[PDB]
Amino acid sequence: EDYAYVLDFMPYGHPDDKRPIHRREPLAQVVGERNFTLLEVSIRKGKQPLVMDRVYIGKGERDVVYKIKRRLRYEDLTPAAKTELPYVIEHIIKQDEKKYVDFFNDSITTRMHQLELLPGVGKKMMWAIIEERKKRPFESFEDIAQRVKGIQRPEKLIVSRIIYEIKNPQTKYKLFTA
């Protein structure tokens, strides 16, 4: 990951930190914009990151993040971070609609289609999506919600899958978190 989005900022770190206050550093939990990697990072002095802020976590000079502390499991996220996760992921995919709308217009597996990997998309829905794809490839999300009748917001479907993968690293297929 080169960039991540802020899920939660803790000026004094975790509330249960057992170390003396002067040794606690400001921390943020973030989600990578490419593979949705969950990370805990320290924040530089004088910075007050906001939820949804995009921060650089690459090898060059970092303006806000100090150090990357460790990769996190879904359970390691703070309550606030968990609440924000779906909203932040949705924000991320909307900033790169091209790549995801591309997923819809989508190889096959066997007796199971990839579209079915999306929570809220079963046999009926997948064929409905495939039937529309034939005519003309989708050019956006709104285009999908308008053409594919009764289909839940495509963004929500994507967010649901990403969250599913983040929670289940052992799942056999990693569509967006590989």
The C-alpha atoms of residue 126 and residue 37 are separated, in whole angstroms, by 28
- Technique behind this structure? X-ray
Domains in the chain, start-ordered, CATH in brackets? 1-72 (2.40.50.140), 73-168 (1.10.150.280)
Amino acid type, 39: L
List all residues 6 or more positions away from 160 whose beta carbon is below 8 Å from its beta carbon: 118, 119, 120
Output the furthest CA–CA distance in the chain (Å, rounded).
64
Evaluated on CA atoms 4, 67, 38, 35, the torsion sign reads: positive
Are 127 and 87 in contact by the 8 Å Cβ rule? The answer is: no
Residue 75 burial by Cβ neighbours in a 10 Å radius (0-12, 13-18, 19+): exposed
Backbone angles phi, psi at 116, to 5 degrees: -75, -15
Strands 3-10 and 27-32: antiparallel
The token pair that represents 137 in the structure block: 């490839």
